[PDB]
Amino acid sequence: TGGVKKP
Amino acid sequence: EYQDGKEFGIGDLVWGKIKGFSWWPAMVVSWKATSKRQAMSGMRWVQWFGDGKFSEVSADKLVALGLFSQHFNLATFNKLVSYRKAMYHALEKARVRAGKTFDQLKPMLEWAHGGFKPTGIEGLKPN
């Protein structure tokens, strides 16, 4: 729910 | 950081485009905010309004949030509550910065779609 956004 | 001749600096409000999604509002951040790694030259780390996540994005896949009507996606806005939440937090931030007073989205959206008057895009700048 944090960190890097996944396309 | 980000001295590559390409556009955008830390604190800039932007629209960002990654594979699979509409243009989405974000803020340019330093790589240190991300606890990841330095961005490749030509790229920027952005943090997305709404979910607070980070992406490394090409400066050619970013436009100033100020160009609002040109990238606002009405279908996505109608289809997704996440997009509407994203719009609020991003416009809230836009408001505070520029000088703007005023479901509470409405006049923020209108102000945005209308070209951020009185201030214009100039009042979106970071400091």
- Taking CB atoms and an 8 Å limit, are B53 and A7 in contact across chains? no
Structure method? X-ray
DSSP line for chain B: ---SSSS--TT-EEEE--TTS--EEEEEE-GGGTTS-PPPTTEEEEEETTT--EEEEEGGGEEETTS-TTT--HHHHHH-HHHHHHHHHHHHHHHHHH------HHHHHHHHHTTSTTT-GGGGS--
What is the residue range of B12's domain? 1-65
Residues B59 and B86 in one domain: no
The number of folded domains in chain B is 2
The CATH number linked to B56 is: 2.30.30.140
Distance from A7 to chain B by nearest Cα, in Å? 6
CATH number at residue B87: 1.10.720.50
- Where is A3: in which H helix or E strand? none
Interface probe for A, chosen from B54, B57, B58, B82 (most Cβ of A below 10 Å), is B54
